[PDB]
Structures are given as structure tokens and as C-alpha cells.
Design an enzyme around this catalytic site. Sequence first.
Site, PDB file in Angstrom:
ATOM      1  N   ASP A  64       0.135  -0.197  -6.773  1.00  0.00           N
ATOM      2  CA  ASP A  64      -0.989  -0.945  -7.348  1.00  0.00           C
ATOM      3  C   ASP A  64      -0.655  -1.859  -8.521  1.00  0.00           C
ATOM      4  OD1 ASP A  64      -3.625   1.595  -7.114  1.00  0.00           O
ATOM      5  OD2 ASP A  64      -1.870   1.243  -5.841  1.00  0.00           O
ATOM      6  N   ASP A  99      -0.524  -2.316  -2.235  1.00  0.00           N
ATOM      7  CA  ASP A  99      -1.756  -1.536  -2.340  1.00  0.00           C
ATOM      8  C   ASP A  99      -2.746  -2.315  -3.207  1.00  0.00           C
ATOM      9  OD1 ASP A  99      -3.695   0.808  -2.700  1.00  0.00           O
ATOM     10  OD2 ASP A  99      -2.075   1.818  -1.619  1.00  0.00           O
TER      11      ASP A  99
HETATM   12  O1  LIG Z   1      -5.378   6.989  -0.838  1.00  0.00           O
HETATM   13  C1  LIG Z   1      -4.096   6.600  -0.365  1.00  0.00           C
HETATM   14  C2  LIG Z   1      -4.137   5.220   0.272  1.00  0.00           C
HETATM   15  O2  LIG Z   1      -4.983   5.313   1.440  1.00  0.00           O
HETATM   16  C3  LIG Z   1      -5.053   4.115   2.205  1.00  0.00           C
HETATM   17  O3  LIG Z   1      -3.795   3.737   2.691  1.00  0.00           O
HETATM   18  C4  LIG Z   1      -3.564   4.029   4.081  1.00  0.00           C
HETATM   19  C5  LIG Z   1      -3.249   2.731   4.816  1.00  0.00           C
HETATM   20  O4  LIG Z   1      -4.339   1.826   4.693  1.00  0.00           O
HETATM   21  C6  LIG Z   1      -2.963   3.029   6.285  1.00  0.00           C
HETATM   22  O5  LIG Z   1      -2.615   1.824   6.950  1.00  0.00           O
HETATM   23  C7  LIG Z   1      -1.795   4.016   6.375  1.00  0.00           C
HETATM   24  O6  LIG Z   1      -0.636   3.375   5.923  1.00  0.00           O
HETATM   25  C8  LIG Z   1       0.553   4.178   6.041  1.00  0.00           C
HETATM   26  C9  LIG Z   1       1.593   3.619   5.098  1.00  0.00           C
HETATM   27  O7  LIG Z   1       1.109   3.850   3.759  1.00  0.00           O
HETATM   28  C10 LIG Z   1       1.933   3.228   2.769  1.00  0.00           C
HETATM   29  O8  LIG Z   1       1.355   3.457   1.532  1.00  0.00           O
HETATM   30  C11 LIG Z   1       3.339   3.836   2.813  1.00  0.00           C
HETATM   31  O9  LIG Z   1       4.169   3.199   1.857  1.00  0.00           O
HETATM   32  C12 LIG Z   1       3.935   3.661   4.214  1.00  0.00           C
HETATM   33  O10 LIG Z   1       5.190   4.320   4.284  1.00  0.00           O
HETATM   34  C13 LIG Z   1       2.985   4.230   5.276  1.00  0.00           C
HETATM   35  O11 LIG Z   1       3.474   3.918   6.574  1.00  0.00           O
HETATM   36  O12 LIG Z   1      -2.091   5.208   5.635  1.00  0.00           O
HETATM   37  C14 LIG Z   1      -2.385   5.000   4.232  1.00  0.00           C
HETATM   38  C15 LIG Z   1      -2.669   6.362   3.631  1.00  0.00           C
HETATM   39  O13 LIG Z   1      -1.511   7.184   3.652  1.00  0.00           O
HETATM   40  C16 LIG Z   1      -5.641   2.987   1.344  1.00  0.00           C
HETATM   41  O14 LIG Z   1      -5.679   1.774   2.085  1.00  0.00           O
HETATM   42  C17 LIG Z   1      -4.799   2.796   0.080  1.00  0.00           C
HETATM   43  O15 LIG Z   1      -5.415   1.831  -0.761  1.00  0.00           O
HETATM   44  C18 LIG Z   1      -4.655   4.126  -0.673  1.00  0.00           C
HETATM   45  O16 LIG Z   1      -3.745   3.959  -1.753  1.00  0.00           O
END
Ligand SMILES: OC[C@H]1O[C@H](O[C@H]2[C@H](O)[C@@H](O)[C@@H](OC[C@H]3O[C@@H](O)[C@H](O)[C@@H](O)[C@@H]3O)O[C@@H]2CO)[C@H](O)[C@@H](O)[C@@H]1O
Length: 549
Positions: free
Chosen positions: A338, A357
Site C-alpha cells: 500500500d 495494493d
Molecule cells: O485483505 C487482503 C487483500 O485482499 C484482496 O486481495 C486479493 C486479490 O484482490 C485477489 O486477486 C487475490 O490475489 C492473490 C495475490 O495477492 C497478492 O497480494 C499477492 O502478492 C500474490 O502473490 C497473490 O497471488 O487474493 C488477494 C487476497 O489474498 C484485496 O484486493 C486487497 O486490497 C487486500 O490487501
Amino acid sequence: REFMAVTANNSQLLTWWHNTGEINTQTPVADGNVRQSGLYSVKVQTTPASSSLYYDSFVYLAIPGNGMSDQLQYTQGYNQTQAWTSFLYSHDATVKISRNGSSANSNVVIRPTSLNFPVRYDNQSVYITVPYSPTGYRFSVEFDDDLISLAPSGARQPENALLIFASPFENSSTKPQPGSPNSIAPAPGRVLGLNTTSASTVVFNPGVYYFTGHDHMVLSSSVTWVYFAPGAYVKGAVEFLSTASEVKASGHGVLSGEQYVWYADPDEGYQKASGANNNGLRMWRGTLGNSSQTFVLNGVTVSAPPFNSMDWSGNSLDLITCRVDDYKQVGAFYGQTDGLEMYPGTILQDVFYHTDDDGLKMYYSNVTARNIVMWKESVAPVVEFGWTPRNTENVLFDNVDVIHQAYANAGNNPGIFGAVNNYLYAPDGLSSNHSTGNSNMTVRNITWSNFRAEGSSSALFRINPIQNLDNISIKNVSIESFEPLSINTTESWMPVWYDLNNGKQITVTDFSIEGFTVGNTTITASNAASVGRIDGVDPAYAGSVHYID
Ligand SMILES: OC[C@H]1O[C@H](O[C@H]2[C@H](O)[C@@H](O)[C@@H](OC[C@H]3O[C@@H](O)[C@H](O)[C@@H](O)[C@@H]3O)O[C@@H]2CO)[C@H](O)[C@@H](O)[C@@H]1O
Ligand SMILES: *[C@@H]1O[C@H](CO)[C@@H](O)[C@H](O)[C@H]1NC(C)=O
Ligand SMILES: *[C@@H]1O[C@H](CO)[C@@H](O)[C@H](O)[C@H]1NC(C)=O
Ligand SMILES: *[C@@H]1O[C@H](CO)[C@@H](O)[C@H](O)[C@H]1NC(C)=O
Ligand SMILES: *[C@@H]1O[C@H](CO)[C@@H](O)[C@H](O)[C@H]1NC(C)=O
Ligand SMILES: *[C@@H]1O[C@H](CO)[C@@H](O)[C@H](O)[C@H]1NC(C)=O
Ligand SMILES: *[C@@H]1O[C@H](CO)[C@@H](O)[C@H](O)[C@H]1NC(C)=O
Ligand SMILES: *[C@@H]1O[C@H](CO)[C@@H](O)[C@H](O)[C@H]1NC(C)=O
Ligand SMILES: *[C@@H]1O[C@H](CO)[C@@H](O)[C@H](O)[C@H]1NC(C)=O
Ligand SMILES: *[C@@H]1O[C@H](CO)[C@@H](O)[C@H](O)[C@H]1NC(C)=O
Ligand SMILES: *[C@@H]1O[C@H](CO)[C@@H](O)[C@H](O)[C@H]1NC(C)=O
Ligand SMILES: *[C@@H]1O[C@H](CO)[C@@H](O)[C@H](O)[C@H]1NC(C)=O
Ligand SMILES: *[C@@H]1O[C@H](CO)[C@@H](O)[C@H](O)[C@H]1NC(C)=O
């Protein structure tokens, strides 16, 4: 004699080098070494362009996983790398970029494209004339023959990015004067003792410094200023213990979290945090007492954050405010990287963000953020105001250029202006349940102006009104093109929401859209749902969304 880099250090230009630069694209570099780009060479010359000498400017390089192959699983899995160089200037300068002698001639595209700097090609090099601006510039130089397509969006982006950070000289407020009072200047190498020093100011002069992946820069309660000199490269993460009226981090050096594994937990030996406990190491952390504190962040380049870039500790975050300028976040290939928190009263400007993020986290009132360049990766919206219902008012985000986006699906919670679901009931942010909102809270008087999305983009907005919305204005937003309809990331929506406890319907009042364009098409109420892809506004809110044409 053997060729050596020649750097500038005068009233018009300042560049630097590192004698321990290391060409490495697969493993961690030595503790005292600095990963260097093996593809791009950058030199700078104060105008007018002449046969005069050009000065070498070190080009840093960040890679996904930071050389730890077992950490690649925590990235998006692309093969992109990100190189960058910084220099200080007070006069127009020509930036000479060179690639090896075997590299063919290729035109470049500079992003933001609105800059329109003079560019000339000659002798296997690219010359960019960068005008002096008191707030400097942060831009991407993209070689046409280095562009690749990122699946499944198909986004066209540099496989090997090159960012240029031209910044103004440091004044007495951001640079400690000679022999500053009660200051300490650690020698290069392993840095120890700062968590118990009696010093008020910590000065990192040119050189390489590192904590390790199992320790970080905890600054004693007496430290109110940490300075990263141009030419200083510090591997670590900062945590102020001071509860004073102001804690400051300044200088144009680098603070890199490359030695920490993703989600490194400082309370568990810096190993990956167990069960997404949210205790991953922040690059910037502070702790409040019972009095107001201002966090001044100026000039620094943060690279490779292992988790969220910043968060303060405290019971009342209304006591903290931020003053951020000329700051950059690069090499953030890990997820949950973030952007900064913009606490109440924050003024943030002239920033570059590479993030995977939540980018601009609109969680607090009376915040102003302007002149931002963002390289959004594959997860979370550009602007985020979901997760938890809040009372937030008087916010202005202006002149934000999202130079890139690479979303893949709806689960990524894509969108320029987004507000995901309630984290307490939907930790991943997406859920058909829209009945956990708060009808007693309101986000009011919000202005998002002069936003630009270059290349293919996600939806204009995907907003869950988890609390009432009133007087939200979008003024001037240009989307070059949309990502494929197929991946479900481009349709904008705003479903009807209800109060968690009493079922009262959440309200949306005066949500206006003006100056919205998609490519060369002006968006009006007539084609908003078709060309603008704004086809998900709940009928209960349709009358509250106004197109100012
Ligand atoms: O609260 C945690 C996180 O949740 C959401 O993220 C999700 C993604 O939107 C999905 O696409 C998926 O992504 C998996 C992906 O996550 C990365 O962070 C990681 O580096 C990578 O290795 C992995 O393949 O799942 C995540 C949740 O695990 C939301 O959108 C985020 O804002 C939030 O931070
Ligand atoms: C530039 O020169 C000043 C004055 O000697 C010195 O303090 C500073 O470290 C130098 N910076 C670089 C990176 O050369
Ligand atoms: C030379 O630069 C090109 C890009 O212009 C790159 O593809 C190539 O790998 C480089 N040569 C090597 C292997 O150093
Ligand atoms: C990197 O990935 C792109 C697709 O995203 C592909 O076209 C390119 O060949 C890859 N480069 C390497 C070195 O594998
Ligand atoms: C200071 O930090 C070191 C790590 O560098 C740690 O071992 C030590 O316990 C800390 N001291 C205090 C008083 O917390
Ligand atoms: C804040 O804490 C200090 C030290 O504990 C105390 O002297 C002061 O009175 C407190 N201020 C308020 C507003 O209570
Ligand atoms: C925002 O500023 C207004 C004054 O314009 C003030 O009344 C309000 O309390 C501020 N909000 C916060 C939480 O600081
Ligand atoms: C609304 O926000 C603007 C800044 O965007 C501020 O100047 C103004 O005082 C705020 N108050 C309202 C609701 O007009
Ligand atoms: C797009 O994603 C949302 C959220 O998962 C889903 O409800 C909707 O049906 C999807 N649209 C389609 C069918 O592509
Ligand atoms: C929505 O989620 C809340 C919180 O868990 C729950 O109490 C409620 O029963 C759910 N209703 C729906 C939409 O299924
Ligand atoms: C929107 O852009 C136009 C330029 O076409 C400009 O005149 C206007 O001032 C902009 N609106 C805002 C609020 O900046
Ligand atoms: C909103 O306020 C009402 C009382 O006015 C309360 O019943 C309800 O629980 C509140 N909303 C929340 C926090 O769910
Ligand atoms: C507008 O953009 C479309 C799609 O890129 C293109 O086919 C068309 O020629 C453009 N028209 C103008 C006026 O440039």
C-alpha cells in the site's frame, strides 16, 4: 587509466555513484553492495547541450522477490524489473540514456505523456531535455522495443522499466547543516545502536548501510530527524519511537526493504507473519503519545517494501498528520504494498507510487494530495475508501496520472475510484452481501480532479457505499482505453447498501461526473452506460449520479 564514473556536485546539478554496485538479476546482492541496472546507463548535463562533460548518475535496480526465489510466489508472477535514477538540479538538464552497444535504435515514450519533453536520438543514445521545476519530475522512459504484453489484460508495458527522478536541491529544512546539534552519523555497513542513541538527528551520508533481514531501524525516543543523503543507500525500515511534535525523514537517498521477506513480522524474528495477522514490517512507522505529531517525509526513495508502506501506532490517529513531498516508492512487486496513510490534515504532493495494493487511501478528513504519478500493478483500486465505514470530509485529490494498470479479474477489486466491501465480513474485499454498512456515517465533500489513466484501464469506479455518500465530484478524468470486457474489470458499479444493525438504506447524494473521456470520446449521460461502461449504478442511486455536460 581505467574508465571511472564521473559525478557532478555543483550548484546546478548533483549526481552520485556507488563503488559497490552489483550487476545481478537473480539473487540477493551482498550486504554492502547495491543492485545496479545492467541494461541502462544514465548521464546528465546541465544545459545548454555541448561537447561538455556528461555526469554519471547511478541507476538502481529492483527485481521481484529481491533475489529470493522462494518469495516469487508472493508477487504477481510477471517478469518485469524496475530500474531508476535520481539527481538534484536547479537548472534545465539533458538526460542521456544509453543501452549496450548491441541494442538497436528504438523510439521512447515518456510517461506521463503530458510532460512533452524534447527528445532526440543520436549515437545509440536518447537525449531528454528536462526543464527545471521547483517540484521536480518523476517519469518513466519506455523503449518501444522493450514493451511486452501482460496477460490477461494485454497491457503494453516495459519489461524493464526505467524511472527518472529529477528533484530540486535540499534546503535547511530537509538537509542537516554542517555539524548539526546532537547529531550522529553512522559509518557504512551494519548500523547498530540507533534504538538507544541520545542523538536527535541521524545522518546517513553517501555510502551503503544495512540492518539485515532480521532487524530494522528502530529510532530512539530522542530521534526526531533521520536524513538520507543523496548517494546514501540504506537497507532497512524506519520506526520512530519519538512522540514529539514532529518526526522527520528527509533527503534524496534510498531506504530499501529488499532484505526482508514478504510480510516479515518484526515480533516473530522477521519471519513471514503467521495467519495474515497484519503485522508485516512497515517502511515508515511511528507511535503516538497523548499529543499531536506531524510526520514530515521529503525527498526519500523507498524501494522494495515487504508489506504496507506505512502506518502509525496509536489509539487516536487524529493526532497524527503528514507533510509529504518529492517522495517515491519503487520496486514494490509484492502484494499488499500500500501507499502511505494520509492522516487528517495531510498535504501530500509530487509523489511517485509503484504499488500492488491500495494506492491513495482516502481514510481521513481534510486531506489534499496532488501531482502524483502511479504505476498501479494488479491489485486494489487506485483510490480506496472501502473496508470500513467512516466519517470523512473535505478531501481533494488533484492531478493524478496512473501511467499503468495490469489488472486480471474482478477479484482484484480493480478501478480508479473504489470502495471495497467490509473487511470484518469480507477480508478479500469482494462479496454480494451489501448489508454491513453504517447509515450513521458519511463521506462528504470529496473532489477527485484531473485524473488520467494511460494505456488500458480498469473501471472508472467500483464503489460500495458502506456509509452514506454526499457531494462527491469527479472533474476531468481521461481513460485512454479500457481493458478487455472479458476480464470483468472495466464496468463501473455502485450497488445499494444497507445498515448492518437497523437495515436503513445507505444514501448517495450529489455524486457528479464532469469531463470524463474514454479515448477520443466525450462521455455524457447519453453514452455513460455504453462507451463509459458505467452500467452498474443501482437504480436507487441512479437519480443521484449527475453527468455535468
Ligand atoms: O485483505 C487482503 C487483500 O485482499 C484482496 O486481495 C486479493 C486479490 O484482490 C485477489 O486477486 C487475490 O490475489 C492473490 C495475490 O495477492 C497478492 O497480494 C499477492 O502478492 C500474490 O502473490 C497473490 O497471488 O487474493 C488477494 C487476497 O489474498 C484485496 O484486493 C486487497 O486490497 C487486500 O490487501
Ligand atoms: C557533494 O559535496 C558536498 C560538499 O563537500 C558533500 O557534503 C556531499 O556529500 C557531496 N555529495 C555527493 C553525492 O557527491
Ligand atoms: C543489450 O540491451 C538489450 C536491450 O536493448 C537487451 O535485450 C540485451 O540483453 C542486452 N545485452 C546483454 C545480454 O547484455
Ligand atoms: C516476459 O513476459 C512477457 C509476457 O508478459 C513475454 O512476452 C516475454 O517474452 C517474457 N520475457 C522473458 C525473458 O521470458
Ligand atoms: C536495540 O536493537 C537491537 C537490535 O539491533 C536489539 O537487539 C536490542 O534489544 C534493542 N535494545 C533495546 C533497549 O530495545
Ligand atoms: C499528556 O501526557 C503528559 C505526560 O504524561 C502530561 O504531563 C500531560 O498533562 C498530558 N496532556 C493531557 C492533555 O492530558
Ligand atoms: C477538518 O477540518 C475542519 C475545519 O475545516 C474541522 O472542524 C474538523 O474537525 C477537521 N476534521 C478532522 C477529523 O481533523
Ligand atoms: C470542501 O472541500 C474543499 C476542498 O476540496 C474545502 O476548500 C471546503 O472548505 C470544504 N467545505 C465544503 C463542504 O465546501
Ligand atoms: C463480474 O464480477 C462480479 C463480482 O464477482 C460478478 O458479480 C459479476 O456477475 C461479474 N460479471 C460477469 C458475469 O462477468
Ligand atoms: C450479510 O453479512 C452479515 C454479517 O456477517 C450477516 O449478519 C447477514 O446475515 C448477511 N446477510 C446476507 C446478505 O446474506
Ligand atoms: C478541467 O479541464 C479543463 C481543461 O480542458 C480546465 O479548463 C478546467 O479548469 C479543469 N477543471 C478543474 C476542476 O481543474
Ligand atoms: C446507527 O444508529 C442507530 C441508532 O440511531 C443504531 O441503531 C445503529 O446500530 C447504528 N448503525 C450501526 C452502527 O449499525
Ligand atoms: C478515436 O479512437 C478510435 C480507437 O482508437 C480510432 O479508431 C479512431 O480513428 C479515433 N478517431 C479520432 C477522431 O481520432
